[PDB]
Amino acid sequence: GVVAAAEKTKQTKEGVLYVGSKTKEGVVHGVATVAEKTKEQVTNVGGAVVTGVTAVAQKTVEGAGSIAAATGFVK
Amino acid sequence: GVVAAAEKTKQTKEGVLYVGSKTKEGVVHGVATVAEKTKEQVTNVGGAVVTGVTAVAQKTVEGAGSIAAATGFVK
Amino acid sequence: GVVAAAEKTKQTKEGVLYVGSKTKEGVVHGVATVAEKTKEQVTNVGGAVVTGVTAVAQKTVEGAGSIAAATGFVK
Amino acid sequence: GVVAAAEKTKQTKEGVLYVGSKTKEGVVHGVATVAEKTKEQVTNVGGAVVTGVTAVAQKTVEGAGSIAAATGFVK
Amino acid sequence: GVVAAAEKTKQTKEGVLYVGSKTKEGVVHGVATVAEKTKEQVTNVGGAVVTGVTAVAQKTVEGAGSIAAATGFVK
């Protein structure tokens, strides 16, 4: 029942990017799931995750983008 | 029952980006799920997560973007 | 029953961005879910999360954007 | 029953952004869910979350944006 | 029941990128799942994860992109 459908039917400076970064110390951890003495952990990450000292996300979804996620359990 | 549908049907400086970043110390953790002595944890992250000392998100969803998420459990 | 539908049907400086950032110390944690001695935690994050010392979000949803989320449990 | 639908049907300086930030110390936590000795926590965050020492959100929803969220439990 | 379908039916400077990065120390961890004395951990990461001291994501989804994910267990 977890359905993700994406359809795209298609019948000057555009999207131009300039980044200049100067970093001395950089610690980036991105997507992280840490468990200590944990019993029962469920984690889900979906989509676009842009992370860091200089993070730029230009025009992430120009067409069709669908994210379906059923996260959990049954007892 | 967790359905995400996206449809895009398509029949000068546009979206131009300039970033200049100068950082000495940078610690970025992004998406994180930490559990200590935890029993039963459910986490869900969806979409666009732009994070960091200099975070820029230009024109994230130009077309169709759908995020469906059922997060949880049954007992 | 958690349905997210997005449809986009399409039949000078536009969206131009300038960021200049100068940071000495930067700590960014973004999306975080922390549990200590917790029993039973349900978390859900959806959409666009732009975070950081210099956070810029330009024209996040130009088209169709839908976020559906059922977060919780049954006993 | 948690339905989010978005439709966009489409048949000089526009949206131009300038940010200049100069920060010495910056701590940004974004979206956070912290539980200590907690039993039973349900959290949901949806939409656009722009956070940080310099946070700018220009023209977040130019088209169609829908956020549906059923957050809670049944006993 | 975990179905992801993507269809794309198709019948000046465009998408041009400039990055200049100068880093002295950089620690990047990307996607990480750490468990210590943990019992029972389920993790799922899907989509585009761009991470690092200088992270740039230009035009991530120009066509059709669908991410379906059922993350969890049954007892």
Author numbering:
A (entry chain B), B (entry chain C), C (entry chain D), D (entry chain E), E (entry chain A): 14 to 24, 33 to 96
From the manuscript:
α-synuclein misfolding and aggregation into fibrils is a common feature of α-synucleinopathies, such as Parkinson’s disease, in which α-synuclein fibrils are a characteristic hallmark of neuronal inclusions called Lewy bodies. Here we present cryo-electron microscopy structures of six α-synuclein fibrils in complex with lipids, revealing specific lipid-fibril interactions. We observe that phospholipids promote an alternative protofilament fold, mediate an unusual arrangement of protofilaments, and fill the central cavities of the fibrils. Extensive classification during 3D reconstruction revealed three dominant protofilament folds (L1, L2, and L3) that form in total six different fibrils by different quaternary arrangement.
